[PDB]
Amino acid sequence: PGRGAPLAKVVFRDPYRFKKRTELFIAAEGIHTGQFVYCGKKAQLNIGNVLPVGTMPEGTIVCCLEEKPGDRGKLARASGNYATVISHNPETKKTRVKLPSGSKKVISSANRAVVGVVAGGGRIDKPILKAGRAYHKYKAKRNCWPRVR
Amino acid sequence: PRKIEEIKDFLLTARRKDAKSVKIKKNKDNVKFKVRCSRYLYTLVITDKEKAEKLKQSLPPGLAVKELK
Amino acid sequence: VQRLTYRRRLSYNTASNKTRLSRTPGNRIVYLYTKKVGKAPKSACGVCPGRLRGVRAVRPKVLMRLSKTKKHVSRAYGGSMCAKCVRDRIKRAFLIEEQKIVVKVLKAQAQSQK
Amino acid sequence: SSHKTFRIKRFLAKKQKQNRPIPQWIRMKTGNKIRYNSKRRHWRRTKLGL
Amino acid sequence: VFIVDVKANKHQIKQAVKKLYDIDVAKVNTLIRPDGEKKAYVRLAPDYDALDVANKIGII
Amino acid sequence: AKRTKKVGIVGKYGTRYGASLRKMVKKIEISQHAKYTCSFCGKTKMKRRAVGIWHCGSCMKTVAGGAWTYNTTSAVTVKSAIRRLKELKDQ
RNA sequence: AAGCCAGAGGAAACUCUGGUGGAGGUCCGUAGCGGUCCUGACGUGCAAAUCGGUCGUCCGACCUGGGUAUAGGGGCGAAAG
RNA sequence: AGAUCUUGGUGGUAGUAGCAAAUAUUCAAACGAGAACUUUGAAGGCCGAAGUGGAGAAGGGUUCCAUGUGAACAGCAGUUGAACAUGGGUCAGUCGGUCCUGAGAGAUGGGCGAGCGCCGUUCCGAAGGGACGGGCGAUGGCCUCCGUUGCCCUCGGCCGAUCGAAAGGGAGUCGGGUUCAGAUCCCCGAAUCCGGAGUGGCGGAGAUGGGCGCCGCGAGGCGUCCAGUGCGGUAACGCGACCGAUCCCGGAGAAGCCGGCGGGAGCCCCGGGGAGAGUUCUCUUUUCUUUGUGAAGGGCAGGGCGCCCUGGAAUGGGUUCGCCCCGAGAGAGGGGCCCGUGCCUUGGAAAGCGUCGCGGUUCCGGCGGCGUCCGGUGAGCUCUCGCUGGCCCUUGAAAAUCCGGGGGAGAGGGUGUAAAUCUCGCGCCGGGCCGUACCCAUAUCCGCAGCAGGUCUCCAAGGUGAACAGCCUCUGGCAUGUUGGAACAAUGUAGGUAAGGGAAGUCGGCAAGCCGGAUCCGUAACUUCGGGAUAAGGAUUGGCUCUAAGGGCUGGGUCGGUCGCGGCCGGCGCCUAGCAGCCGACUUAGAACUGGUGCGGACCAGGGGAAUCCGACUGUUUAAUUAAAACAAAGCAUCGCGAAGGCCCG
Numbered sequence A: 001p002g003r004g005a006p007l008a009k010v011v012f013r014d015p016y017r018f019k020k021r022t023e024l025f026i027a028a029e030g031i032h033t034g035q036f037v038y039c040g041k042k043a044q045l046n047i048g049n050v051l052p053v054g055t056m057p058e059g060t061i062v063c064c065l066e067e068k069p070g071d072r073g074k075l076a077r078a079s080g081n082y083a084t085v086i087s088h089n090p091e092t093k094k095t096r097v098k099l100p101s102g103s104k105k106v107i108s109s110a111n112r113a114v115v116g117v118v119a120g121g122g123r124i125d126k127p128i129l130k131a132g133r134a135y136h137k138y139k140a141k142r143n144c145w146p147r148v149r
Numbered sequence B: 001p002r003k004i005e006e007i008k009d010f011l012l013t014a015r016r017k018d019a020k021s022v023k024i025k026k027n028k029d030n031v032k033f034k035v036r037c038s039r040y041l042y043t044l045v046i047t048d049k050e051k052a053e054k055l056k057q058s059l060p061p062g063l064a065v066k067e068l069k
Numbered sequence C: 001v002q003r004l005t006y007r008r009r010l011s012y013n014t015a016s017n018k019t020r021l022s023r024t025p026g027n028r029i030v031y032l033y034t035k036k037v038g039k040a041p042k043s044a045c046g047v048c049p050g051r052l053r054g055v056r057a058v059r060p061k062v063l064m065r066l067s068k069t070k071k072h073v074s075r076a077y078g079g080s081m082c083a084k085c086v087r088d089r090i091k092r093a094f095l096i097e098e099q100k101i102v103v104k105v106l107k108a109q110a111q112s113q114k
Numbered sequence D: 001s002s003h004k005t006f007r008i009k010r011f012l013a014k015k016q017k018q019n020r021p022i023p024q025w026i027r028m029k030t031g032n033k034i035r036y037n038s039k040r041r042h043w044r045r046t047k048l049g050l
Numbered sequence E: 001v002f003i004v005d006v007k008a009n010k011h012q013i014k015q016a017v018k019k020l021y022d023i024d025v026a027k028v029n030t031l032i033r034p035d036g037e038k039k040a041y042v043r044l045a046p047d048y049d050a051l052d053v054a055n056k057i058g059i060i
Numbered sequence F: 001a002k003r004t005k006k007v008g009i010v011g012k013y014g015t016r017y018g019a020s021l022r023k024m025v026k027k028i029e030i031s032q033h034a035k036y037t038c039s040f041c042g043k044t045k046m047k048r049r050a051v052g053i054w055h056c057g058s059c060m061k062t063v064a065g066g067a068w069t070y071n072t073t074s075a076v077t078v079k080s081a082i083r084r085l086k087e088l089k090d091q
Numbered sequence G: 001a002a003g004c005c006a007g008a009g010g011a012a013a014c015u016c017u018g019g020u021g022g023a024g025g026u027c028c029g030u031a032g033c034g035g036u037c038c039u040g041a042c043g044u045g046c047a048a049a050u051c052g053g054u055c056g057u058c059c060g061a062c063c064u065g066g067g068u069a070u071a072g073g074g075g076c077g078a079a080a081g
Numbered sequence H: 001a002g003a004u005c006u007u008g009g010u011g012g013u014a015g016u017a018g019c020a021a022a023u024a025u026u027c028a029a030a031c032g033a034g035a036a037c038u039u040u041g042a043a044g045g046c047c048g049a050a051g052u053g054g055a056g057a058a059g060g061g062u063u064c065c066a067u068g069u070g071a072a073c074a075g076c077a078g079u080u081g082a083a084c085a086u087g088g089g090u091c092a093g094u095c096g097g098u099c100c101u102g103a104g105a106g107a108u109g110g111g112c113g114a115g116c117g118c119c120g121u122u123c124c125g126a127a128g129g130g131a132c133g134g135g136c137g138a139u140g141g142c143c144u145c146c147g148u149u150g151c152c153c154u155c156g157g158c159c160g161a162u163c164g165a166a167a168g169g170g171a172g173u174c175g176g177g178u179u180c181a182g183a184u185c186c187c188c189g190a191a192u193c194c195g196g197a198g199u200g201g202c203g204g205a206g207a208u209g210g211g212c213g214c215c216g217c218g219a220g221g222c223g224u225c226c227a228g229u230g231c232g233g234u235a236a237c238g239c240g241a242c243c244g245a246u247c248c249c250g251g252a253g254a255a256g257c258c259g260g261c262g263g264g265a266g267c268c269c270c271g272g273g274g275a276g277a278g279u280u281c282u283c284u285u286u287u288c289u290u291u292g293u294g295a296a297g298g299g300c301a302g303g304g305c306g307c308c309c310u311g312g313a314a315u316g317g318g319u320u321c322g323c324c325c326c327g328a329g330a331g332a333g334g335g336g337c338c339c340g341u342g343c344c345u346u347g348g349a350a351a352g353c354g355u356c357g358c359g360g361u362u363c364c365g366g367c368g369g370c371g372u373c374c375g376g377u378g379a380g381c382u383c384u385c386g387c388u389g390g391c392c393c394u395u396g397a398a399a400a401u402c403c404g405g406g407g408g409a410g411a412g413g414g415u416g417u418a419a420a421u422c423u424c425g426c427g428c429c430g431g432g433c434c435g436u437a438c439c440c441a442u443a444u445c446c447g448c449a450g451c452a453g454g455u456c457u458c459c460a461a462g463g464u465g466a467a468c469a470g471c472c473u474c475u476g477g478c479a480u481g482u483u484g485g486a487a488c489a490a491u492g493u494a495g496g497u498a499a500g501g502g503a504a505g506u507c508g509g510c511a512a513g514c515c516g517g518a519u520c521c522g523u524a525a526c527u528u529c530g531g532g533a534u535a536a537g538g539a540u541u542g543g544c545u546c547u548a549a550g551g552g553c554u555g556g557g558u559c560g561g562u563c564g565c566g567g568c569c570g571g572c573g574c575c576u577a578g579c580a581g582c583c584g585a586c587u588u589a590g591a592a593c594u595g596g597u598g599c600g601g602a603c604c605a606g607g608g609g610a611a612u613c614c615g616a617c618u619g620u621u622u623a624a625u626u627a628a629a630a631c632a633a634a635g636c637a638u639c640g641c642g643a644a645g646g647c648c649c650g
Ligand SMILES: [Mg+2]
Pocket: A147, A148, A149
């Protein structure tokens, strides 16, 4: 609720104790239930896989890009959005990407990201057509909608 | 309440230790024996009058045989 | 008609204030406060939407006073998973483990060369 | 209401007990100067504090 | 029927009645009166008559 | 018979909101409420559950797709681009 | 309204007819909510804002109880200080 | 003597205004000093099930209920009272609170702060005080032996105290009787949940069978060896249990709104059979009332299934009101499971009720007779269960709590009338604390009050009718809303009517009036093609007597060729254009007859058209003079910001 992008409930195996870990990814457009996704350095180019941008080709596009190495996804998360890998350089471990706004940004080559666009398509294409549908849309987000000039 | 189908399994519930009393009710077409145990009230229904006559005299001693009429 | 009243102090038509009409031996209509409708368990596969068979559908705390047989089925994963998806997992476990034997032999005939 | 706490009910009990007239024999005491119970409270005329 | 201390529960009321009247009681009910005094309905055992117990208590 | 001449599905909106806004939302509502064929089981039972979520009633397979269409033309060219970059990544 | 069934006219392109269906910040209109006009009643009132008729809306930005949160140059305001 | 002076008292006004919102009272009697108002009876009326009825939540706090008083109060009165006085009244394991979390509140650590303190709620903490497992021992003691106890080994994150709902979640109580006032709480009777059991309370299960040496005519026994933590069905799954920890997985709790169908109940309706009343001037086999079976078990209908087996379908078929379904297994045949609130049964008739009587015990859960029966209906109303859809840039709680499965660490006996163990049947004990009366409103609450205001819900009969509309009625309730009597002046408030004219009135058709329901016709400009539209305009409408049309159930046999006036197999036959009998809803159409042309006869119930301005629309707004053209709105456009950030609090 309050988001255009659907969420994927991925289940991994905990590598240290007998347990099942449940992650909440942002669904990339194309992934389905009962599908394996692979996260790591050795994961290969497939939609939904979470692999570092430093091991990607120079034209691939990503879904949930990290702003910093180590944290979790922070960029291109809203529905239909993506970043693009522009260039790397093996020296100084840097990678330049193109954000959804068109800004070019330099991030570390260890930053992880899902592969593909994020599901939710062109949600903004449909006219709302109704004050009531704008009321319901913002009732799920916050108290900001009826704007007095 | 529990219903008892045949005769001999009513006899040992009648002679059970927690059996407080036995009540004999006569109707137009059957006779009902009701032993009041601790949890349930076991009712055994006999349509034959002479069968109920024999069962009435076959009850264990030391138990109430109160008749309802 | 003879009209009825609530027998408890909850006067609102909430989900726990559900009643049904009953005729007493005294020939009057009264409310009988019903229990909630129980649900059979879903399947642990989380795929097929039907609920399990052979298991009584009651409220969760009723299951404490039920017999063991009434709460499960005589099968592996009985009472927790459907029969259909148990057959699939039995086949899946066998066939993938056979595939492991396939690739182990396949690399074993690969390592015949330096 | 019908639903009350113990503290509220205990409070209403005291206010009930002290809402009674003075005994007749009080007026015969020497140096009495008390005519009636001036702290009487009717449930409709004035309401309780709580 | 007794007027009892407001802090006395059913266990204490039953035990008190049992010892100082030498009777056996079956069950005890309890309400608090609108004046604040607790009142106990103490049902005696079937082999104890409430009428002649109340006689020797002195409330005939 | 043919009950309307041109409004189609947006006849439910009456005269409101303007002709071009009803026309713009007409093609979106047709695709959003349409039943697509499932690519996993072949049955035409894949219908939208929420925005971006598509679900097949037969095989109970849920997929992440577009807001109104099952898959956007953006993601279709993306999946093809990733495949070409993968086959370029190896040799 | 969409969806669906049947029939008819067409060389195709396609078009037409009768049903079915039950959409909608849809219409008439109760309860509810509101408060247009009579500038009616009353105006030392029933009432420190009420009453009568007539009215607006009545599946939705709907009405409403209780529980919470926001406190004075602060709050909150589909905005009238 | 003044200060619209302060406090207190008193006049004229003035026996004046007034005691006029919601139709209404009347007769007789009783008590009593006293009756328009009390009570009883009889009439006439109202509320008319969206109540003036029956019950609750909040709030009140004794107003509840008996008896008495007649001072003051109840704006008249009162013999009455929600007044006054004296007493009495609220009984729980299973109705709530209590328990859980929700939005949120809030300590501790830490940080800040002159300081009371306040920031923060996992953040900057050495935040687990628990555990069957085992070892070291104490032998504590019915020292056989298993229970205590200290330390150690091993395992253990809800990762955060705590509070937060008498409408959310949350195990399990119902039937009858009873009081002046309490009852799902008391009594009677039927159950049921949770917790406990060390000596193990009884059973049953586990679990008690084979092989061989012999004995014994055999049947039946002795010794050894070997198993035995249940069994059945192809399957869905079933059976009365069915060893098992740490750990893991899952389920239930746990889910929006709207639509259309179907099942069940309660109510309503119809035809009879009883019992009791009502009418009888005449008719009326008539009119009215009444005509039960709780929970909890067992069995069976019935509803549902996205469950199984056989088999393999196009000349595609199955099927719904709609849909929809099928080589990923249709149709068909046979099964399995769930729910079972329905019926029968134990409860159960002994109770209850209706009647007709007999006793008395100031005032009996008295006693007795008879009955408590058979059917038919439905787009009917209300609940409830189920199926299937639609809508969302809206996806419609959480946690206590309970359960199933995976795994197999372990445990238990050496063939004993056996062990460990048991979610199986029965038996034993306990369930503490607080609330519980009453009002719940034109008189028990707030509004200074018995104030036309305000204040959250549940149940919901007949007629008419589209209807929870309006109008009338039944069950239930009441006395006209803080007075009565007599008149019927003006002026008024509220309601009507009005000849001829028809807005000439007025700032202005303000107000009032016209229209109005349904059926059949017929509908313009303009238009964003959806609308305009009930456009505009016209006809009909009663009563009575018919006639058509629209259904559902059964049975459709050619025969003794024999005997299980009847049945198995069949020489023996062609309803196959379908009939024959029975049963029952409304609804539509057509016609005749008929009335002083009157007929949506009350009630209900759009005046219409042609334009100009503004706002797109729906919505919102100054509670108490402005509902608008004002605000909002979707749409359009611009601006800032890549988090070391934008905007903002502090
Ligand atoms: Mg604006």
